[PDB]
Amino acid sequence: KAVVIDDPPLRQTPEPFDEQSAYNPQSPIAIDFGSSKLRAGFVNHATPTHIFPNALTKFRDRKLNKNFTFVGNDTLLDQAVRSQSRSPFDGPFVTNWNLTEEILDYTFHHLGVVPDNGIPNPILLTERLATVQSQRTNWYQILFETYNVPGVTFGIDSLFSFYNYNPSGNKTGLVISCGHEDTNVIPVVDGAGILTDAKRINWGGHQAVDYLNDLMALKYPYFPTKMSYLQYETMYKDYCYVSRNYDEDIEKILTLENLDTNDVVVEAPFTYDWRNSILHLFLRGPRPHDSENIHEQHQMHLNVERIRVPEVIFQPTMGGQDQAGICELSETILLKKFGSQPGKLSQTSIDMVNNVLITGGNAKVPGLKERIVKEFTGFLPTGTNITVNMSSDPSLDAWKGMAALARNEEQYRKTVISKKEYEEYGPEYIKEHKLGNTKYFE
Amino acid sequence: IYIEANTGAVKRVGRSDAYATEFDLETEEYVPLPKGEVHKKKEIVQDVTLHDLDVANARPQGGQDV
């Protein structure tokens, strides 16, 4: 079995921009202010028209006024402007609001909407769970008096995903989102997301790539070249999966018969028996080390512990966050809440078990589904049927939630806030519709 | 544990594997979780003789069960 090298490079997009001049001045705009990927489009189309990495650069060019090539895949057109590109969206929520105004101005150019006053269409907004009130007042300002929108509603994107795959709007189910930055589990009763009962995990996927960067830097402190963070996401999306059970795998993960198929080695770009030594197997894998070869100094022997970086979702204690994992949150929700006791499930809990939806940008990792169903049947009573659902693209389904609420008109009128209600009630006002945030108090 | 429904024997196998890191060192024998169903039912046949019965219920000193 000869060693194969793996290259870590990402090429550039030669065709960044496209738009259509014709538009409907009555059809609203569906938007998704995603951390990893901004998604845009109309109402009538089933899939989102514009997907963009939600990033901008202020490219400075001498003799031509130093303000060029702001938002989109044109940042991915050159590696230099890709490196200087600044996503404004911070940990909780975005820091730089006029940067967001640049993004909204760019996409309003890219729907081809000819401007009538500020904006002649309703705007369909996505919003993270349990938003800080100052953040929503800034949202109210930037929408209503900066862009003159007739109507804006905002809610939790995974709740819209839950509505999208169960469009009756009154089903009982459990939704577990794994987003870019945080991940959370929300219980839903009768189509209403009970937000007193939900719990949120401060890990996401940003900290997963950060963890992979830190482990790969500490494993090889004397690595010659430095490896880019985009290459870290390439390495994370390519070679990572979730164990069926973590506890018995890690004893077997450095056994010699395992390393033949487990270990895949990455090549960084450039231009005392070993069977007894477990450091040799950890650092250099199943082939003997060639200490003179310039390939081996640039060889990144990962997949010795490829399981460890996805597994920290189920156990955030390796991530440093003292929060219970997804399994314990499911135990508390399904066996201690909504009238269910250990040994006697209430009917709402059984209906929640019957419909479990997982979604988000971090669900693209293989092996999550079988681990989730096995962990669920670990603690549920025997005979309780468990049905867990996956998307083709779990990240793209919040936009279909936008399209679904845009279709359902009698539900759409309940969610939509108006300019008149905003000016009458002030920015400290949120409609307590079921598919969105609730009041801070009763 | 071990519980037989008919006889009523209670046998303690040991503490669970998920409770192994509460302390770094303690006397509790940590056995893993059983991989099968909790409830297992099977039928057997008991071949006894008459003499097994007569020495069962004629003990000069009792306590054959313990």
Binding site: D90, K199, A324 | -
Partner: protein
């Protein structure tokens, strides 16, 4: 006027606002805040 305010500072003065509201309320359990929806620590070792 628009300056970059720290996300940690945003969590800080959100906490201050709920603390102010609760201290003027009691002298009213919060239904759903950013702190209350944070997951608790695990109970198993």
């Amino acid at each position: 006027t628009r300056r970059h305010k720290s996300a940690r500072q945003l969590i800080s003065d959100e906490n201050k606002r709920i603390n102010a509201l609760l201290t003027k309320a009691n002298k009213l359990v919060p239904k759903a805040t950013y702190f209350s929806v944070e997951a608790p620590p695990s109970i198993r070792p």
